[PDB]
Amino acid sequence: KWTYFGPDGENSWSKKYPSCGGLLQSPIDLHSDILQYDASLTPLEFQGYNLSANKQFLLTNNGHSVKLNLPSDMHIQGLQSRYSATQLHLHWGNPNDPHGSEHTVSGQHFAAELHIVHYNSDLYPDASTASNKSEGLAVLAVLIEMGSFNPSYDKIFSHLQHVKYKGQEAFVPGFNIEELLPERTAEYYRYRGSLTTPPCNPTVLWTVFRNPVQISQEQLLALETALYCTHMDDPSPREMINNFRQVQKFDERLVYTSFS
Amino acid sequence: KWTYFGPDGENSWSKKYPSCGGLLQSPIDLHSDILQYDASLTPLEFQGYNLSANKQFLLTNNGHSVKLNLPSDMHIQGLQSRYSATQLHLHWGNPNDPHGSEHTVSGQHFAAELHIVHYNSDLYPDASTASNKSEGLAVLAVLIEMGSFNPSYDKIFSHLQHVKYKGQEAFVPGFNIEELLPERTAEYYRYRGSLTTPPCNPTVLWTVFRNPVQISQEQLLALETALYCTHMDDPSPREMINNFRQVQKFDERLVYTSFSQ
Ligand SMILES: COC(=O)c1cc(S(N)(=O)=O)c(Cl)cc1S(=O)(=O)c1ccccc1
Ligand SMILES: COC(=O)c1cc(S(N)(=O)=O)c(Cl)cc1S(=O)(=O)c1ccccc1
Ligand SMILES: [Zn+2]
Protein backbone atom coordinates (compact mmCIF):
# COMPACT_ATOMS: atom_id res chain seq x y z
CA LYS A 1 0.00 0.00 0.00
CA TRP A 2 3.14 2.28 0.11
CA THR A 3 6.84 2.09 -0.79
CA TYR A 4 9.96 4.19 -0.72
CA PHE A 5 10.30 4.12 -4.51
CA GLY A 6 8.24 4.53 -7.66
CA PRO A 7 4.59 5.71 -7.83
CA ASP A 8 3.70 4.62 -4.29
CA GLY A 9 6.69 6.39 -2.67
CA GLU A 10 6.78 9.05 0.02
CA ASN A 11 5.46 12.02 -2.04
CA SER A 12 2.23 9.97 -2.51
CA TRP A 13 1.75 8.67 1.07
CA SER A 14 -0.53 11.57 1.87
CA LYS A 15 -3.21 10.31 -0.54
CA LYS A 16 -4.17 7.32 1.63
CA TYR A 17 -2.53 8.51 4.89
CA PRO A 18 -3.51 12.18 5.29
CA SER A 19 -1.30 12.79 8.36
CA CYS A 20 1.77 12.34 6.09
CA GLY A 21 0.91 15.82 4.77
CA GLY A 22 -0.03 17.29 8.15
CA LEU A 23 1.91 18.95 10.93
CA LEU A 24 4.82 17.82 13.08
CA GLN A 25 6.37 15.48 10.46
CA SER A 26 9.58 13.56 11.06
CA PRO A 27 12.42 13.05 10.38
CA ILE A 28 14.30 16.36 10.42
CA ASP A 29 17.76 17.83 10.10
CA LEU A 30 19.20 18.39 13.53
CA HIS A 31 21.27 21.37 12.66
CA SER A 32 23.10 23.76 14.98
CA ASP A 33 20.80 26.80 14.51
CA ILE A 34 17.66 25.11 15.89
CA LEU A 35 19.29 23.29 18.88
CA GLN A 36 18.55 24.60 22.41
CA TYR A 37 20.02 23.17 25.63
CA ASP A 38 17.31 22.22 28.13
CA ALA A 39 18.39 21.30 31.69
CA SER A 40 15.06 19.49 32.34
CA LEU A 41 16.21 16.72 29.99
CA THR A 42 17.35 14.16 32.53
CA PRO A 43 18.73 10.69 31.74
CA LEU A 44 16.22 8.03 30.77
CA GLU A 45 16.24 4.64 32.50
CA PHE A 46 15.90 1.50 30.38
CA GLN A 47 13.87 -1.02 32.40
CA GLY A 48 13.41 -4.66 31.43
CA TYR A 49 15.74 -4.30 28.43
CA ASN A 50 17.71 -7.36 29.53
CA LEU A 51 15.44 -9.87 27.81
CA SER A 52 15.28 -13.40 29.12
CA ALA A 53 17.76 -15.65 27.31
CA ASN A 54 14.99 -18.27 27.80
CA LYS A 55 12.27 -16.32 25.91
CA GLN A 56 12.17 -15.93 22.10
CA PHE A 57 11.03 -12.84 20.25
CA LEU A 58 9.41 -12.70 16.84
CA LEU A 59 11.38 -11.19 13.95
CA THR A 60 9.17 -10.39 10.90
CA ASN A 61 9.60 -9.00 7.39
CA ASN A 62 6.27 -7.25 6.69
CA GLY A 63 7.51 -5.63 3.47
CA HIS A 64 8.95 -2.18 4.68
CA SER A 65 11.68 -2.99 7.30
CA VAL A 66 12.44 -5.85 9.48
CA LYS A 67 10.77 -5.70 12.98
CA LEU A 68 11.72 -7.44 16.25
CA ASN A 69 8.76 -7.70 18.61
CA LEU A 70 9.45 -6.65 22.19
CA PRO A 71 7.63 -7.51 25.42
CA SER A 72 5.51 -4.94 27.22
CA ASP A 73 7.34 -5.21 30.57
CA MET A 74 10.33 -3.57 28.79
CA HIS A 75 9.93 0.21 29.24
CA ILE A 76 11.38 3.70 29.50
CA GLN A 77 11.34 5.38 32.92
CA GLY A 78 11.76 9.17 33.18
CA LEU A 79 9.04 10.52 30.81
CA GLN A 80 5.67 11.96 31.99
CA SER A 81 4.15 8.53 31.63
CA ARG A 82 5.61 5.04 31.39
CA TYR A 83 6.27 4.11 27.77
CA SER A 84 6.41 0.32 27.16
CA ALA A 85 8.32 -1.30 24.34
CA THR A 86 6.52 -2.74 21.35
CA GLN A 87 9.12 -3.34 18.60
CA LEU A 88 12.43 -2.27 17.08
CA HIS A 89 13.43 -1.84 13.45
CA LEU A 90 15.99 -0.14 11.20
CA HIS A 91 16.32 2.15 8.17
CA TRP A 92 19.20 2.14 5.71
CA GLY A 93 20.39 3.14 2.23
CA ASN A 94 22.15 0.99 -0.37
CA PRO A 95 25.68 -0.20 -1.18
CA ASN A 96 26.19 2.49 -3.84
CA ASP A 97 25.07 5.30 -1.47
CA PRO A 98 25.38 3.88 2.07
CA HIS A 99 23.82 6.86 3.87
CA GLY A 100 20.33 5.87 4.88
CA SER A 101 19.65 7.31 8.41
CA GLU A 102 16.33 9.19 8.68
CA HIS A 103 17.54 12.01 10.93
CA THR A 104 20.53 14.03 9.74
CA VAL A 105 22.99 16.08 11.82
CA SER A 106 24.11 19.37 10.26
CA GLY A 107 22.81 18.02 6.91
CA GLN A 108 24.77 14.72 7.14
CA HIS A 109 23.22 11.28 6.93
CA PHE A 110 24.52 8.40 8.97
CA ALA A 111 24.74 4.99 7.38
CA ALA A 112 21.59 3.71 9.08
CA GLU A 113 19.24 4.26 12.04
CA LEU A 114 17.67 1.99 14.67
CA HIS A 115 14.25 2.83 16.19
CA ILE A 116 12.96 1.27 19.44
CA VAL A 117 9.18 2.02 19.46
CA HIS A 118 7.36 2.44 22.77
CA TYR A 119 3.75 3.37 23.60
CA ASN A 120 2.11 5.18 26.53
CA SER A 121 1.01 2.21 28.59
CA ASP A 122 -0.33 4.35 31.44
CA LEU A 123 -3.03 5.54 28.98
CA TYR A 124 -3.45 2.87 26.28
CA PRO A 125 -3.53 -0.95 26.04
CA ASP A 126 -1.30 -1.37 22.95
CA ALA A 127 0.76 0.66 20.43
CA SER A 128 -2.01 0.25 17.81
CA THR A 129 -4.52 2.13 20.01
CA ALA A 130 -1.86 4.59 21.25
CA SER A 131 -0.54 5.46 17.77
CA ASN A 132 -3.26 7.93 16.73
CA LYS A 133 -3.72 9.34 20.22
CA SER A 134 -2.29 12.26 22.18
CA GLU A 135 1.14 11.47 23.70
CA GLY A 136 0.76 7.98 22.28
CA LEU A 137 4.33 7.02 21.29
CA ALA A 138 7.97 7.52 22.17
CA VAL A 139 10.88 6.36 19.99
CA LEU A 140 14.53 5.97 20.82
CA ALA A 141 16.72 6.57 17.75
CA VAL A 142 20.32 5.38 17.43
CA LEU A 143 22.45 6.69 14.59
CA ILE A 144 24.69 4.07 13.01
CA GLU A 145 27.97 4.56 11.20
CA MET A 146 30.46 2.18 9.59
CA GLY A 147 33.36 1.24 11.88
CA SER A 148 34.26 -1.66 14.17
CA PHE A 149 32.29 -4.91 14.19
CA ASN A 150 29.40 -4.87 16.67
CA PRO A 151 28.59 -8.28 18.26
CA SER A 152 25.41 -6.95 19.84
CA TYR A 153 23.92 -5.78 16.56
CA ASP A 154 24.86 -9.19 15.12
CA LYS A 155 22.38 -10.71 17.57
CA ILE A 156 19.76 -9.28 15.19
CA PHE A 157 21.66 -9.33 11.88
CA SER A 158 22.64 -13.03 12.13
CA HIS A 159 18.92 -13.74 11.65
CA LEU A 160 18.33 -11.57 8.56
CA GLN A 161 18.63 -14.47 6.15
CA HIS A 162 15.60 -16.22 7.71
CA VAL A 163 13.40 -13.19 7.08
CA LYS A 164 14.63 -12.40 3.53
CA TYR A 165 11.12 -12.23 2.01
CA LYS A 166 7.81 -10.56 2.91
CA GLY A 167 5.83 -12.78 5.32
CA GLN A 168 8.87 -14.65 6.63
CA GLU A 169 9.50 -14.77 10.37
CA ALA A 170 12.16 -16.10 12.72
CA PHE A 171 12.50 -16.46 16.50
CA VAL A 172 15.32 -14.53 18.18
CA PRO A 173 16.47 -15.56 21.74
CA GLY A 174 16.34 -12.70 24.24
CA PHE A 175 19.38 -10.51 24.73
CA ASN A 176 20.12 -7.19 26.41
CA ILE A 177 18.63 -4.53 24.09
CA GLU A 178 20.58 -1.85 26.01
CA GLU A 179 23.71 -3.18 24.22
CA LEU A 180 22.30 -1.57 21.04
CA LEU A 181 22.43 1.93 22.57
CA PRO A 182 25.43 4.25 22.15
CA GLU A 183 27.87 5.71 24.65
CA ARG A 184 26.60 8.45 26.95
CA THR A 185 22.89 7.88 26.51
CA ALA A 186 22.34 10.89 28.83
CA GLU A 187 23.23 12.99 25.75
CA TYR A 188 20.27 13.27 23.39
CA TYR A 189 18.12 15.43 21.06
CA ARG A 190 14.42 15.65 21.89
CA TYR A 191 11.49 16.93 19.86
CA ARG A 192 7.82 16.30 19.21
CA GLY A 193 7.23 14.76 15.81
CA SER A 194 5.60 11.95 13.91
CA LEU A 195 5.93 8.37 12.69
CA THR A 196 8.37 8.40 9.74
CA THR A 197 6.22 5.79 7.98
CA PRO A 198 2.55 5.75 7.09
CA PRO A 199 0.27 6.57 8.80
CA CYS A 200 2.67 9.43 9.87
CA ASN A 201 0.63 10.27 13.04
CA PRO A 202 2.04 13.40 14.83
CA THR A 203 2.13 11.46 18.13
CA VAL A 204 5.79 10.59 18.65
CA LEU A 205 8.09 12.00 21.31
CA TRP A 206 11.53 11.55 19.68
CA THR A 207 14.76 10.93 21.54
CA VAL A 208 17.76 10.79 19.15
CA PHE A 209 20.95 9.90 20.97
CA ARG A 210 23.80 12.33 20.35
CA ASN A 211 26.46 9.63 19.76
CA PRO A 212 26.34 7.00 16.97
CA VAL A 213 27.17 3.34 17.27
CA GLN A 214 29.43 1.53 14.81
CA ILE A 215 28.93 -1.62 12.81
CA SER A 216 31.40 -3.16 10.43
CA GLN A 217 31.44 -2.62 6.69
CA GLU A 218 30.38 -6.28 6.31
CA GLN A 219 27.49 -5.87 8.72
CA LEU A 220 26.23 -2.74 6.94
CA LEU A 221 26.45 -4.49 3.55
CA ALA A 222 24.55 -7.51 4.93
CA LEU A 223 21.78 -5.24 6.22
CA GLU A 224 21.64 -3.47 2.83
CA THR A 225 21.52 -6.72 0.79
CA ALA A 226 19.81 -9.37 2.96
CA LEU A 227 16.22 -8.31 2.53
CA TYR A 228 13.47 -7.94 -0.06
CA CYS A 229 10.12 -6.11 0.10
CA THR A 230 8.39 -8.83 -1.92
CA HIS A 231 7.09 -12.34 -1.25
CA MET A 232 9.41 -15.26 -2.05
CA ASP A 233 7.19 -16.12 -5.12
CA ASP A 234 6.91 -12.59 -6.66
CA PRO A 235 8.29 -12.94 -10.22
CA SER A 236 9.26 -9.28 -9.90
CA PRO A 237 11.32 -9.02 -6.69
CA ARG A 238 12.10 -5.64 -5.12
CA GLU A 239 15.11 -5.21 -2.82
CA MET A 240 14.56 -3.65 0.61
CA ILE A 241 16.86 -0.63 0.29
CA ASN A 242 16.65 3.16 0.81
CA ASN A 243 13.84 2.56 3.36
CA PHE A 244 14.23 6.04 4.94
CA ARG A 245 12.04 9.17 4.62
CA GLN A 246 13.53 12.39 3.32
CA VAL A 247 13.90 15.14 5.96
CA GLN A 248 10.88 17.33 6.51
CA LYS A 249 10.65 21.13 6.76
CA PHE A 250 10.82 22.09 10.44
CA ASP A 251 10.08 25.82 10.74
CA GLU A 252 9.82 28.13 13.76
CA ARG A 253 10.53 25.16 16.02
CA LEU A 254 13.33 23.90 18.23
CA VAL A 255 15.12 20.75 19.00
CA TYR A 256 16.01 20.54 22.64
CA THR A 257 19.31 18.99 23.74
CA SER A 258 20.26 17.39 27.05
CA PHE A 259 23.88 18.60 26.42
CA SER A 260 25.33 22.10 25.69
CA LYS B 1 -4.11 25.96 -4.27
CA TRP B 2 -0.65 24.54 -3.72
CA THR B 3 1.76 26.14 -1.25
CA TYR B 4 5.06 25.45 0.46
CA PHE B 5 3.52 25.31 3.95
CA GLY B 6 0.53 23.64 5.60
CA PRO B 7 -2.18 21.33 4.26
CA ASP B 8 -1.46 22.21 0.58
CA GLY B 9 2.35 21.95 1.01
CA GLU B 10 4.74 19.72 -0.85
CA ASN B 11 3.81 16.33 0.67
CA SER B 12 0.30 16.94 -0.70
CA TRP B 13 1.18 18.24 -4.27
CA SER B 14 0.92 14.67 -5.67
CA LYS B 15 -2.81 14.57 -4.78
CA LYS B 16 -3.56 17.09 -7.59
CA TYR B 17 -0.40 16.91 -9.67
CA PRO B 18 0.51 13.21 -10.26
CA SER B 19 3.96 13.83 -11.69
CA CYS B 20 4.94 15.30 -8.22
CA GLY B 21 4.77 11.67 -7.02
CA GLY B 22 6.49 10.09 -10.06
CA LEU B 23 9.99 9.63 -11.42
CA LEU B 24 12.93 11.94 -12.08
CA GLN B 25 12.02 14.52 -9.36
CA SER B 26 14.05 17.62 -8.55
CA PRO B 27 15.76 19.14 -6.60
CA ILE B 28 18.45 16.81 -5.19
CA ASP B 29 21.42 16.84 -2.86
CA LEU B 30 24.69 16.91 -4.70
CA HIS B 31 27.12 14.64 -2.86
CA SER B 32 30.15 12.57 -3.72
CA ASP B 33 28.53 9.12 -3.98
CA ILE B 34 26.32 10.08 -6.91
CA LEU B 35 28.77 12.33 -8.91
CA GLN B 36 30.59 11.10 -12.02
CA TYR B 37 32.99 13.11 -14.18
CA ASP B 38 31.94 13.30 -17.82
CA ALA B 39 34.61 14.80 -20.16
CA SER B 40 31.90 15.23 -22.91
CA LEU B 41 30.27 18.05 -20.85
CA THR B 42 31.73 20.93 -22.84
CA PRO B 43 31.15 24.64 -22.04
CA LEU B 44 27.81 26.33 -22.70
CA GLU B 45 27.67 29.59 -24.64
CA PHE B 46 25.20 32.27 -23.56
CA GLN B 47 23.78 34.09 -26.59
CA GLY B 48 21.67 37.28 -26.55
CA TYR B 49 21.91 37.44 -22.71
CA ASN B 50 22.92 41.13 -22.90
CA LEU B 51 19.35 42.47 -23.12
CA SER B 52 19.02 46.03 -24.40
CA ALA B 53 18.85 48.59 -21.55
CA ASN B 54 16.39 50.52 -23.77
CA LYS B 55 13.92 47.63 -23.85
CA GLN B 56 11.62 46.48 -21.05
CA PHE B 57 10.89 42.99 -19.71
CA LEU B 58 7.78 41.94 -17.85
CA LEU B 59 8.03 40.88 -14.22
CA THR B 60 4.99 39.07 -12.82
CA ASN B 61 3.67 37.69 -9.52
CA ASN B 62 1.28 34.75 -10.13
CA GLY B 63 1.10 33.93 -6.38
CA HIS B 64 3.59 31.06 -6.61
CA SER B 65 6.64 32.38 -8.43
CA VAL B 66 7.67 35.89 -9.40
CA LYS B 67 9.04 35.56 -12.92
CA LEU B 68 11.06 37.90 -15.17
CA ASN B 69 10.01 37.13 -18.75
CA LEU B 70 12.84 36.75 -21.22
CA PRO B 71 12.91 37.05 -25.02
CA SER B 72 13.25 33.99 -27.25
CA ASP B 73 16.29 35.52 -29.01
CA MET B 74 18.15 34.77 -25.76
CA HIS B 75 19.44 31.21 -25.93
CA ILE B 76 22.02 28.61 -24.88
CA GLN B 77 24.45 27.29 -27.50
CA GLY B 78 26.11 23.91 -26.75
CA LEU B 79 23.23 21.50 -25.86
CA GLN B 80 21.73 18.97 -28.29
CA SER B 81 19.18 21.53 -29.56
CA ARG B 82 18.99 25.30 -29.22
CA TYR B 83 17.29 26.11 -25.95
CA SER B 84 15.76 29.57 -25.90
CA ALA B 85 14.97 31.55 -22.72
CA THR B 86 11.49 31.98 -21.38
CA GLN B 87 11.76 33.30 -17.81
CA LEU B 88 13.89 33.45 -14.70
CA HIS B 89 12.86 33.35 -11.00
CA LEU B 90 14.25 32.61 -7.53
CA HIS B 91 13.72 30.39 -4.45
CA TRP B 92 14.59 31.56 -0.92
CA GLY B 93 14.03 31.03 2.80
CA ASN B 94 12.82 33.55 5.33
CA PRO B 95 14.21 36.41 7.44
CA ASN B 96 15.05 34.19 10.44
CA ASP B 97 16.46 31.35 8.30
CA PRO B 98 18.09 32.61 5.04
CA HIS B 99 18.75 29.05 3.75
CA GLY B 100 16.30 28.42 1.00
CA SER B 101 18.23 27.00 -2.05
CA GLU B 102 16.44 24.07 -3.68
CA HIS B 103 19.55 22.01 -4.53
CA THR B 104 21.88 21.29 -1.63
CA VAL B 105 25.55 20.42 -1.71
CA SER B 106 26.85 17.72 0.66
CA GLY B 107 23.63 18.19 2.74
CA GLN B 108 23.88 22.01 3.07
CA HIS B 109 21.46 24.65 1.77
CA PHE B 110 22.63 27.82 0.12
CA ALA B 111 20.81 31.07 0.94
CA ALA B 112 18.77 31.05 -2.29
CA GLU B 113 18.82 29.86 -5.90
CA LEU B 114 18.24 31.45 -9.30
CA HIS B 115 16.64 29.40 -12.10
CA ILE B 116 16.86 30.58 -15.75
CA VAL B 117 14.26 28.50 -17.61
CA HIS B 118 14.76 27.68 -21.36
CA TYR B 119 12.80 25.52 -23.83
CA ASN B 120 13.70 23.52 -26.88
CA SER B 121 12.74 26.15 -29.57
CA ASP B 122 14.08 23.90 -32.38
CA LEU B 123 11.23 21.45 -31.67
CA TYR B 124 8.54 23.46 -29.89
CA PRO B 125 6.77 26.84 -30.29
CA ASP B 126 6.79 27.83 -26.63
CA ALA B 127 7.86 26.62 -23.18
CA SER B 128 4.35 25.48 -22.33
CA THR B 129 4.27 22.99 -25.21
CA ALA B 130 7.91 21.92 -24.46
CA SER B 131 7.19 21.38 -20.77
CA ASN B 132 5.30 18.10 -21.63
CA LYS B 133 8.12 16.50 -23.60
CA SER B 134 11.27 14.65 -22.60
CA GLU B 135 14.09 17.22 -22.19
CA GLY B 136 11.69 19.92 -23.49
CA LEU B 137 13.14 22.31 -20.82
CA ALA B 138 16.63 23.21 -19.72
CA VAL B 139 17.22 25.21 -16.56
CA LEU B 140 20.38 26.93 -15.46
CA ALA B 141 20.59 27.00 -11.66
CA VAL B 142 22.81 29.43 -9.77
CA LEU B 143 23.37 28.81 -6.08
CA ILE B 144 23.34 32.04 -4.01
CA GLU B 145 25.27 32.53 -0.76
CA MET B 146 25.17 35.46 1.70
CA GLY B 147 28.18 37.67 0.95
CA SER B 148 28.89 40.88 -0.89
CA PHE B 149 26.17 43.20 -2.25
CA ASN B 150 25.46 42.27 -5.83
CA PRO B 151 24.52 45.23 -8.11
CA SER B 152 23.43 42.86 -10.93
CA TYR B 153 20.91 40.95 -8.82
CA ASP B 154 19.70 44.34 -7.54
CA LYS B 155 18.56 45.08 -11.13
CA ILE B 156 15.81 42.49 -10.33
CA PHE B 157 15.37 43.01 -6.58
CA SER B 158 14.85 46.82 -6.91
CA HIS B 159 11.55 46.18 -8.77
CA LEU B 160 9.80 43.69 -6.58
CA GLN B 161 7.52 46.25 -4.86
CA HIS B 162 5.57 46.80 -8.07
CA VAL B 163 4.90 43.14 -7.94
CA LYS B 164 4.36 42.70 -4.22
CA TYR B 165 1.00 40.93 -4.63
CA LYS B 166 -0.50 38.15 -6.79
CA GLY B 167 -1.72 39.44 -10.15
CA GLN B 168 0.68 42.36 -10.25
CA GLU B 169 3.05 43.13 -13.15
CA ALA B 170 5.85 45.61 -13.77
CA PHE B 171 8.54 46.37 -16.34
CA VAL B 172 12.27 45.85 -15.74
CA PRO B 173 14.79 47.52 -18.10
CA GLY B 174 17.08 45.10 -19.98
CA PHE B 175 20.43 44.23 -18.50
CA ASN B 176 23.12 41.63 -19.15
CA ILE B 177 21.64 38.41 -17.68
CA GLU B 178 25.15 36.86 -17.85
CA GLU B 179 26.02 39.11 -14.89
CA LEU B 180 23.85 36.78 -12.75
CA LEU B 181 26.09 33.78 -13.59
CA PRO B 182 29.02 32.70 -11.35
CA GLU B 183 32.67 32.35 -12.09
CA ARG B 184 33.90 29.42 -14.23
CA THR B 185 30.53 28.55 -15.83
CA ALA B 186 32.41 25.72 -17.60
CA GLU B 187 32.23 23.86 -14.24
CA TYR B 188 28.74 22.48 -13.68
CA TYR B 189 26.61 19.52 -12.51
CA ARG B 190 24.24 18.01 -15.12
CA TYR B 191 21.38 15.67 -14.54
CA ARG B 192 17.89 14.70 -15.74
CA GLY B 193 15.08 15.90 -13.51
CA SER B 194 11.83 17.73 -13.20
CA LEU B 195 10.14 21.01 -12.45
CA THR B 196 10.58 21.69 -8.73
CA THR B 197 7.05 23.18 -8.56
CA PRO B 198 3.73 21.63 -9.56
CA PRO B 199 3.00 20.20 -12.01
CA CYS B 200 6.50 18.64 -11.48
CA ASN B 201 6.88 17.30 -15.04
CA PRO B 202 10.00 15.18 -15.47
CA THR B 203 11.08 17.11 -18.49
CA VAL B 204 14.04 19.24 -17.35
CA LEU B 205 17.71 18.95 -18.26
CA TRP B 206 19.34 20.61 -15.22
CA THR B 207 22.62 22.44 -15.23
CA VAL B 208 23.68 23.58 -11.73
CA PHE B 209 26.80 25.73 -11.79
CA ARG B 210 29.51 24.55 -9.45
CA ASN B 211 30.33 27.95 -7.99
CA PRO B 212 27.83 30.17 -6.10
CA VAL B 213 27.33 33.90 -6.44
CA GLN B 214 26.94 36.29 -3.46
CA ILE B 215 24.19 38.66 -2.49
CA SER B 216 24.22 40.61 0.77
CA GLN B 217 22.35 40.04 4.04
CA GLU B 218 20.38 43.18 3.23
CA GLN B 219 19.40 41.98 -0.26
CA LEU B 220 18.34 38.61 1.23
CA LEU B 221 16.20 40.35 3.87
CA ALA B 222 14.66 42.57 1.19
CA LEU B 223 13.83 39.60 -1.03
CA GLU B 224 12.40 37.54 1.91
CA THR B 225 10.05 40.46 2.93
CA ALA B 226 9.16 41.91 -0.48
CA LEU B 227 6.50 39.55 -1.78
CA TYR B 228 3.11 37.91 -1.07
CA CYS B 229 1.44 34.76 -2.44
CA THR B 230 -1.90 36.51 -2.13
CA HIS B 231 -3.79 39.33 -3.82
CA MET B 232 -3.50 42.88 -2.49
CA ASP B 233 -7.08 42.68 -1.18
CA ASP B 234 -6.92 39.17 0.26
CA PRO B 235 -8.12 39.06 3.93
CA SER B 236 -5.80 36.08 4.57
CA PRO B 237 -2.39 37.34 3.39
CA ARG B 238 0.44 34.83 2.99
CA GLU B 239 4.08 35.88 2.68
CA MET B 240 6.11 34.47 -0.21
CA ILE B 241 8.80 32.76 1.97
CA ASN B 242 10.36 29.29 2.13
CA ASN B 243 9.42 28.74 -1.50
CA PHE B 244 11.85 25.80 -1.97
CA ARG B 245 11.07 22.07 -2.31
CA GLN B 246 12.89 19.48 -0.12
CA VAL B 247 15.44 17.38 -1.97
CA GLN B 248 14.12 14.23 -3.56
CA LYS B 249 15.17 10.55 -3.59
CA PHE B 250 17.69 9.81 -6.41
CA ASP B 251 15.95 6.73 -7.86
CA GLU B 252 19.31 5.25 -9.18
CA ARG B 253 20.28 8.42 -11.09
CA LEU B 254 23.82 9.86 -11.22
CA VAL B 255 24.82 13.52 -11.60
CA TYR B 256 27.49 14.20 -14.25
CA THR B 257 30.15 16.79 -13.59
CA SER B 258 32.11 18.81 -16.15
CA PHE B 259 34.96 19.05 -13.58
CA SER B 260 36.97 16.11 -12.36
CA GLN B 261 38.10 17.61 -9.05
C1 LIG C 1 4.15 0.95 9.77
O1 LIG C 1 4.70 1.49 10.91
C2 LIG C 1 6.01 1.44 11.22
O2 LIG C 1 6.75 1.01 10.43
C3 LIG C 1 6.27 2.21 12.48
C4 LIG C 1 7.34 3.13 12.41
C5 LIG C 1 7.61 4.16 13.36
S1 LIG C 1 9.08 5.09 13.29
N1 LIG C 1 10.16 4.79 11.92
O3 LIG C 1 8.83 6.61 13.26
O4 LIG C 1 9.96 4.92 14.53
C6 LIG C 1 6.82 4.05 14.52
CL1 LIG C 1 7.01 5.16 15.84
C7 LIG C 1 5.81 3.08 14.75
C8 LIG C 1 5.61 2.17 13.72
S2 LIG C 1 4.43 0.87 14.07
O5 LIG C 1 4.43 0.65 15.52
O6 LIG C 1 4.85 -0.27 13.23
C9 LIG C 1 2.82 1.18 13.55
C10 LIG C 1 2.19 0.55 12.48
C11 LIG C 1 0.88 0.89 12.05
C12 LIG C 1 0.23 1.88 12.77
C13 LIG C 1 0.84 2.44 13.85
C14 LIG C 1 2.17 2.17 14.24
C1 LIG D 1 4.65 26.51 -12.23
O1 LIG D 1 5.89 26.36 -12.81
C2 LIG D 1 7.02 27.08 -12.37
O2 LIG D 1 6.88 27.79 -11.46
C3 LIG D 1 8.20 26.60 -13.09
C4 LIG D 1 9.33 26.22 -12.37
C5 LIG D 1 10.37 25.51 -12.89
S1 LIG D 1 11.81 25.24 -11.93
N1 LIG D 1 11.27 26.32 -10.40
O3 LIG D 1 11.95 23.79 -11.95
O4 LIG D 1 12.90 25.97 -12.58
C6 LIG D 1 10.39 25.42 -14.31
CL1 LIG D 1 11.65 24.55 -15.13
C7 LIG D 1 9.32 25.86 -15.15
C8 LIG D 1 8.26 26.47 -14.49
S2 LIG D 1 7.05 27.17 -15.57
O5 LIG D 1 7.77 27.42 -16.83
O6 LIG D 1 6.48 28.37 -14.90
C9 LIG D 1 5.69 26.20 -15.92
C10 LIG D 1 4.49 26.39 -15.42
C11 LIG D 1 3.43 25.48 -15.62
C12 LIG D 1 3.63 24.34 -16.37
C13 LIG D 1 4.84 24.03 -16.94
C14 LIG D 1 5.91 24.97 -16.64
ZN1 LIG E 1 12.66 27.27 -9.91
Residue numbers in the entry:
A (entry chain A): 3 to 262
B (entry chain B): 3 to 263
Question: What's the publication's text?
Answer:
Compound 9a was found at an identical position in the active sites of CAII and CAXII. The same binding mode of 9a in CAII and CAXII could be explained by the same interactions between the compound and conservative residues of these active sites. Like the previous pair, these compounds differ only by their meta- groups: compound EA3-2o contains -NH(CH2)2OH, while 9a contains -OCH3. The positions of both compounds were not similar in CAXII; the para-benzene rings had slightly different orientations, and they were directed into the center of the active site cavity. The EA3-2o bound to CAXII with 3.4-fold greater affinity than 9a (Kd_intr = 0.12 nM, ΔGintr = −59.0 kJ/mol vs. Kd_intr = 0.51 nM ΔGintr = −55.2 kJ/mol).
Since it has been observed that CAIX isozyme is highly overexpressed in numerous cancers, it has been postulated that compounds inhibiting CAIX may possess the anticancer activity and may be used in tumor treatment. Here we have designed a series of compounds, methyl 5-sulfamoyl-benzoates, which bear a primary sulfonamide group, a well-known marker of CA inhibitors, and determined their affinities for all twelve CA isozymes. Eight crystal structures of CA complexes with compounds are presented in this study: 9a bound to CAI and CAII, 3b, 3d, 5b, and 9a bound to CAXII, 3b bound to CAIX and mimic-CAIX (mutant of CAII containing amino acids in the active site as in CAIX: A65S, N67Q, I91L, F130V, V134L, and L203A).
